[PDB]
Structure 1
Amino acid sequence: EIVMMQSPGTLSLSPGERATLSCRASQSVSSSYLAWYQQKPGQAPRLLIYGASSRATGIPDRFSGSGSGTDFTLTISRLEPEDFAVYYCQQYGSSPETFGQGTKVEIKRTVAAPSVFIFPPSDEQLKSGTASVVCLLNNFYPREAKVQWKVDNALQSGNSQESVTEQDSKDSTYSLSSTLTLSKADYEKHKVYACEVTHQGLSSPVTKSFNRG
C-alpha cells in the first residue's frame, strides 16, 4: 500500500504569510487521485483540492495544489485567521486509500518560557487509594516541552499522562498539565517528588519538587 508522508509536522507562521505544505508518496500516485483536506478542532474535514490541483466548490483561491508523481504541494498564498488548522493529503489512486499524517499550521510568536507549578496529592484525595501529582506549565511557546517525573530521583515512566490546551486565541501560547499517578501505598513509600521541565525558553531545565509530609 502507498504511504503518504507530510512535512513539516508543524508549520509555524504569522497571519498573512505564505504556507507551503508537502505531501510525498512512497510510490508514484496518479495525479487525478490526490486530495487535500482541512480540519479545525472538533469539526469534520473539508475538501480543499482534488485531482492534485482542482479547487473544490467555494474554496477561496488562496488555496492551490500542484505536483505529480510522488511530490505534491498545498500552498496557501496568505494565511487568514481561519486558516490555522490541520491539513491532510490523501491518495485514492489505489486501494487501500491512504492519508498523510497531517500538518498543523500554528501561529508563530516569540519564545515564552513556561511558569512551572507542582501540586502534591490533595489531603482529600489521600483518603482514596490513589495519589495524583500534578505539574502545570503555564503559557509557553513553542509547543515543544519535556516533563520528566522523578520519585526519590528515580526517573519515572509508564505512569504519567499529559494534556495540552489549544493555542490561546489572545496570546498564542500553550499550557500543559502532567499528572503522575501512584497507589497511595507507593506514594507513602517515597519522599521526594520532582517535576523536571525542559523548554527552549529556559536557560537550563527547571525543577519543582516537594517532600511528602
Structure 2
Amino acid sequence: VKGMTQSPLFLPVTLGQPASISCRSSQSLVHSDGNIYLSWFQQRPGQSPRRLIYKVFDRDSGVPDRFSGSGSGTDFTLKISRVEAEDVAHYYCMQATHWPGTFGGGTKLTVLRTVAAPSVFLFPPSSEELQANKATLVCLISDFYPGAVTVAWKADSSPSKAGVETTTPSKQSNNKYSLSSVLSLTPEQWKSHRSYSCQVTHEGSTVEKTFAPT
C-alpha cells in the first residue's frame, strides 16, 4: 500500500548537460536484512522496461557509467551526468523492499529548445464526408514548443464541450510538437450553424482560425 512519487513527470534536458529525477516513497524502504531495494528502469517507446539500477546504487549490465543512483530513507535520485541522445526515454523508479513492489508514475525526458509558436490551420469537412451523415472539422497546430497548448472550439460563438479529440506527435528533430484537434458533429448540426472557429492558446498569444460554411 506504498505510494511512489516521481518528480518531475516531464523532464526537458539539454544534450551534454546533467539531468536528475527524484523518487519518494510513502514508507521506509529499509529491509530487515539491512539493504534498501530501490531500482530504476528505462523504457523506450514500443519496448519493455530495462533495469538500470538496483539496490539504490548498483548499475546493471550494459548500463553506461553516466547513470548513477543515490538516496536513503524515502528519497532517491537517478542522475545522468551528461545526457546523450539515446537517453531520451521514459524512466521509472520501483521499490522492491515491500511485496509485491511498487512503480513510480514514470518520467518522460524530452529535449529542451526555444519557445516556438504554432502555425494554426483549420479544415472544413469534405463534401465526400458530408454525404456520410457526419462532419469532422480539423484544427492543426504545427511545429510548436513547449508541448502545452489549449484549443477551444466555438460554433456560432458557442463553446463546445465533448465532441472534440486531440492527438499530439512525439517530439521531432527540430524538437517541436504538432497537435490536431478534431471536432465531430452530425451533418444536421453542421448545416444548422455558420461560423466554425478554433482558438489556440500557447506561449504565443491567442490565435483564432475560422471559416463560414452555411
- Shorter-chain TM-score bucket reads over 0.9
Distance of 2:194 and 2:81 partners within structure 1: 56
Matched, 1:173 2:201: no
Distance of 1:25 and 1:159 partners within structure 2: 39
Amino acid at match of 1:60: P
Distance of 1:206 and 1:39 partners within structure 2: 37
Distance of 2:145 and 2:11 partners within structure 1: 14
After TM superposition, the runs of 4+ consecutive aligned structure 1 residues lying more than 4 A away are: none
Which residue of structure 1 aligns with residue 93 of structure 2?
89
Cα deviation digits, residues 79-135 of structure 1 (max 9, x gap) = 011001111111122234221111111111111110000001111100012111100
Distance of 1:98 and 1:151 partners within structure 2: 46
Distance of 1:168 and 1:106 partners within structure 2: 10
Q: What aligned pairs does 1:31-46 form with structure 2 within 5 A after superposition?
A: 32-46=36-50
Q: Which runs of 5+ in 2 are unaligned?
A: none
Q: What aligned pairs does 1:42-81 form with structure 2 within 5 A after superposition?
A: 42-81=46-85
Matched, 1:157 2:161: yes
Q: 1:198 aligned to 188, 197, 201, which one?
A: 201
Q: 1:146 aligned to 145, 150, 175, which one?
A: 150
Distance of 2:28 and 2:194 partners within structure 1: 58
Amino acid at match of 1:8: P
Amino acid at match of 1:175: S
Which residue of structure 2 aligns with residue 7 of structure 1?
7
What SS does the aligned partner of 2:171 have?
Answer: coil
Which residue of structure 1 aligns with residue 137 of structure 2?
133
* TM-score using structure 1 length: 0.94
Distance of 1:209 and 1:70 partners within structure 2: 52
1:27 shift after superposition: 2.0
Cα deviation digits, residues 149-178 of structure 1 (max 9, x gap) = 112222212211111111112x11111111
What SS does the aligned partner of 2:20 have?
Answer: strand
Amino acid at match of 2:156: D
What SS does the aligned partner of 2:36 have?
Answer: helix
Distance of 1:106 and 1:10 partners within structure 2: 7
Q: Mean Cα displacement is larger for which, 27-36 or 132-141?
A: 27-36
Q: Mean Cα displacement is larger for which, 99-108 or 113-122?
A: 99-108
Distance of 2:61 and 2:87 partners within structure 1: 17
User: How high is the sequence identity, in percent, across the aligned residues?
Assistant: 50
Q: 1:102 aligned to 96, 99, 106, which one?
A: 106
Amino acid at match of 1:192: S
